[PDB]
Design brief:
It is classed as hydrolase. The structure is a homodimer. The first copy, chain A, has about 200 residues and is of the alpha/beta class. The first copy, chain A, has five helices and nine strands; from the N terminus they run E-H-E-H-E-E-E-H-E-E-E-H-E-H. Chains A and B meet through strand 5, helix 3 and helix 4 of A and strand 5, helix 3 and helix 4 of B.
């Protein structure tokens, strides 16, 4: 029952990142319960994905016409990212909330992963995700408290995007109130870790 | 009763942009009803705002320590953007939806505009927006149909962010179903223009 785990980091705070610390904790725990499982880590901040502009979007378009140097690189990077995703069973996504949105580092990743005929396709029954049979875990950190409130659009958003490409089995792990100080940050760390333990012990 | 109008473009489709076409229509109409009003246009795609990373975020932090060359530029750009925003009465925001989110070109803009002590401040009564007395209009284009549905997080998101910095008076103009073909795109153009007319004729 061994499997492959993919971990995506999108925080811009590096070593001070609350979500990266929780991600490391996740890896450590999974490694302990499953010493045979393969674990791949991609830090979207340390290894930044380019912004999707008017030129790169052309690489995502299935065409016959020649591609510019940037488009060729964007296409190669896109294929690499998608192949990586499809090659893993458990997808861990560290998604901090910045200005009520996900980090741009993660957004750039999504913009290169979503492409017709590869991660989703059109059918007479509507869109259909091609990245299937996956189990995702989102570790979303916030400075304030938004959980189950109208100011939390990151959660429903992540759920909508992941579902669109096929990833419908998504578990959320929250770490809020970080901005209130080290006391609250520690509490959030603890609560989030317990949530990770139950997930790691459940499978 | 003359005023200044700011128009922000964030589409990556350039001349093929549905939202930029509606924005131009808006400008043309406002110019007709108010020939004395000043109109400023900033294309966030043609003149791209940098991504907020671990280094630039330091420029948004009110500190005494020396700033790196990038931080100094980011800070100068941030001040310019904020001063521009505060200098106008009517803010028109072209916000296309890409992969269920706003365009990264617009996101980068927001990440440099939101900063404590400038566009918002902390008080014993909670956060408070500093960009006040403004009237905003959002022209959001979509390939599919999400209006009033659970797949539209861009609207509540834009409303949350703009409100956070003080802009609470926001009117929305939708243009959906673009992806269904030129027939629907034209219908959306027409419907959105009527909505713009009522706004321009109302004030």
């Amino acid at each position: 029952s061994l499997s492959k785990v993919l971990v995506l980091k999108s925080s811009i705070l590096a070593g001070y990142s609350q979500s990266n610390q929780l991600s490391d904790y996740f890896v450590e725990q999974w490694r302990e319960k499953h010493s045979a499982d393969e674990i791949t880590v991609r830090d979207l901040a340390a290894n930044p994905i380019p912004v999707l502009d008017g030129e790169l979007v052309g690489a995502l378009r299935p065409s016959d016409a020649p591609l510019t140097p940037r488009q060729q690189e964007a296409l190669a990077l896109s294929d690499e990212l998608i192949a990586e995703l499809k090659a893993h069973d458990v997808i861990v996504i560290a998604a901090p909330m910045y200005n009520f949105n996900i980090s741009t580092q993660l957004k750039n990743y999504f913009d290169l992963v979503a492409r017709a005929g590869v991660t989703f396709r059109y059918t007479e029954n509507g869109p259909e995700g091609l990245v299937t049979g996956k189990k995702a875990i989102v570790i979303t950190s916030r400075g304030g408290i938004h959980k189950d409130g109208p100011t939390d659009l990151v959660t429903p958003y992540l759920s909508t995007f992941l579902g669109f490409i096929g990833i419908t089995d998504v578990k959320f792990v929250f770490a809020e109130g970080i901005a209130y100080g080290p006391e609250m940050a520690a509490k959030a760390q603890s609560d989030a870790k317990a949530a990770i333990d139950s997930i790691v012990s459940a499978e």
